[PDB]
């Protein structure tokens, strides 16, 4: 089938801007001390499935990595624990500097396939 | 329910308070 | 496309490996301190055919012992210890860990402590009596004298406990206190045993072992590769880009 | 980034470091005054991965 | 949810006492590590400095 | 006491090493707003037809 | 056989063992 094509890409569209989105606020927050109730900013990923053979591809949901928080030494500080450790985002800074250029890679490359797979179905749309 | 379907009930609206009251 | 993973999986062990780095030398003057050493390990992987990528992950195999210079501060009860000297304190949970820091303080009762951890000696918890000047022996003796008393009442009222760690066996812990291995500790017992073949002096207290040679050359290192791989990431990120639009018709 | 994070505790204790050394040298003419000396720490450690 | 926008805030000042010129004026003077002043404000309210 | 004047209470170890960090964050940030806007910049010509 | 062929049965799991038992 050349309709499924579009729902292929489309999901391949979304999945990537979502992952870029999340790239995007991990950067945003590398360095956020506390969230709206004193909750310490935690990495987040997305989850990427097959949609089912094979087919497109869904974020399945997103998660916050299991990763110890960097915490650091601020003892004048009201969050700050019983041994004055506050907890800080464990977010580093490569790993999305290199998420988002796969990201926008892939986005790209699914443009080129719909663009490609559009252009010889109008082609195919007048056999004859 | 999934999202990119269709449903006929209008989602609520989306806020971002800075603090819990 | 995948090869731009590794180069900043590398990258980004650079800079965990500069922040060890960074790490060591902040606490340069933190006396009984043992540095941290830094390694990066490859890592291959084995695939079907063709294995070409082999990633690298830091790595610190643990602390050099090569023990440190040591101030004469001509305080009574500072003690300094041999080459493989360890005073053995109290951890919170109870646990023996093993320290090189001679800075002992004394409490209001007679207690002694290190940095919050009550050194133990030859039975439990050593308590001198309450407000009595203290001295240390050449082999871990200790001496109390009463103010006010004469020179001649000058009492031993408790020993040091000193152990000997080669170590290659020893591990650093989260509060950075050393213990035993596995290994270690099931060839040489839970506890160990305090060796006569240890000999400490007071009035001097051992400092850092910190090389600004070997930092200094590390951090030049670690930057020159961590360009080196910026500019690996910008060359594959240029190539699958233009690549792309092959894909187009 | 952990890496400032720490050398800015260094510079601190450093700093602190050089200003008890100050005040020492500063009332050397004080009666009965008894030099004071600073003792620094080491923080907890983070282990990324056990052995 | 993914989005999870940014805003700067300022938790109030820091107490940490600064250092102090000896100005041998008779009349200038310093607080103890937590001492103000209080003085009155142009509406009239009170108000604490050092 | 008297005849002391006490001053303010910077930290220019503090004061610096925001200032770089701010300066960094700001670079990777404006790196993030370029890439978005040339990656978008081509769903257009996609929905061209 | 040659890369870029095709196969019946899937390619092994991959793995990076950080030291090996």
Same mark, same amino acid.
């Given at each position: ?11 391949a569209?979304?999945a ?5 989105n999340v790239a995007?606020?991990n ?6 001390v506390t969230?709206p109730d ?17 087919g497109?591809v869904?974020?399945?949901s ?7 928080e ?6 004048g500080?009201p969050?700050?624990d019983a041994?004055?450790?506050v907890?800080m985002p ?14 926008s890679?892939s ?5 080129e396939?719909l663009?490609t ?12 | ?13 989306n ?7 | 496309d ?8 590398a990258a980004?062990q650079t800079?965990?490996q500069?922040?060890?780095?960074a ?13 941290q ?5 490859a890592? $291959?992987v #084995?695939?079907?055919s063709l294995?070409?990528?082999? *990633? %690298?992950?830091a790595?610190?195999? @643990? +602390?050099?012992?090569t023990?440190?210079q040591?101030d004469?501060?001509?305080? $009574?009860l #500072?003690?300094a210890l041999?080459?493989?000297?360890? *005073? %053995?304190?109290?951890?919170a949970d @109870? +646990? ?5 820091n ?5 409490? $209001?009762?007679?207690?002694?402590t290190?940095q ?12 001198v009596?309450?407000?009595?000047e ?6 871990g003796?200790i ?6 008393d004469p020179?001649?009442?000058v009492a ?13 066996e ?5 509060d ?7 290994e270690?500790?099931?060839?040489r017992g839970?506890?160990?045993?305090a060796?006569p073949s240890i000999?400490?002096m007071?009035?001097?207290?051992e ?6 040679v070997?930092?200094?050359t590390?951090?030049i290192?670690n930057?020159?590769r961590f360009?080196?791989?910026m ?13 792309n639009?092959?894909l187009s018709m | 980034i952990?890496?400032?994070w720490?050398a800015?505790t ?7 470091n050089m200003?008890?050394?100050?005040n020492n ?5 004080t009666?009965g005054?008894?030099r004071?000396?600073?003792?620094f720490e080491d ?9």
């Open positions: 089938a050349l309709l499924n094509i579009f729902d292929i890409a489309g999901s569209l979304a990537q801007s979502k992952r870029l995007a606020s950067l945003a927050n590398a360095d956020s969230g004193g909750q310490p900013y935690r990495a987040k990923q997305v989850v990427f499935q097959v949609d089912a053979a094979t497109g869904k974020v399945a997103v998660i916050e990595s299991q990763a110890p960097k915490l650091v030494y601020e003892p500080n969050l700050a041994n004055g450790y907890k464990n977010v580093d800074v490569v790993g999305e500097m290199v998420n988002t250029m796969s990201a890679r986005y790209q490359a699914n443009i396939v663009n797979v559009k252009s010889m179905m109008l082609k195919t749309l007048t056999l004859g | 329910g999934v999202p990119g379907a269709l449903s006929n009930q209008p989602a609520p609206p806020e971002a308070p800075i603090a819990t009251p | 995948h090869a731009i993973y590794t180069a900043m999986g980004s800079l965990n500069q922040a060890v780095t790490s060591n030398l902040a606490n340069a003057s933190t006396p009984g301190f043992r540095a050493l830094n390694a990066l390990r890592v $291959p #084995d695939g079907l294995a070409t990528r082999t *990633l %690298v992950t790595s610190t195999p @643990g +602390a050099d012992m023990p440190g040591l004469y501060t001509s305080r $009574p #500072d003690v041999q080459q493989d000297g360890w *005073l %053995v304190v109290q951890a @109870g +646990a023996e860990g093993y320290t090189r001679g800075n002992i303080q004394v409490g $209001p009762t007679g207690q002694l290190i919050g951890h009550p050194v133990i000696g030859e039975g439990g918890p050593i308590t009596p309450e407000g009595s203290i001295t240390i022996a050449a082999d003796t001496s109390a004298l009463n103010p006010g020179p001649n009442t031993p009222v408790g020993r040091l406990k000193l152990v000997k760690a080669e170590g290659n020893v591990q650093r812990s989260d950075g206190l050393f213990r035993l291995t596995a270690a500790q099931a060839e839970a506890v160990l045993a060796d000999r400490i007071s009035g001097v207290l400092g850092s072992n910190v090389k600004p070997e930092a200094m590390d951090m290192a930057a020159r360009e080196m791989q500019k690996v990431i910008t060359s594959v990120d240029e190539n699958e880009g233009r690549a639009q092959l | 952990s890496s400032l720490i800015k260094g510079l601190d204790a450093q700093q602190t200003d008890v050394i100050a040298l500063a009332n050397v003419s009666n005054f008894k004071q000396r600073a003792v923080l907890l450690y983070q282990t990324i991965r056990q052995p």
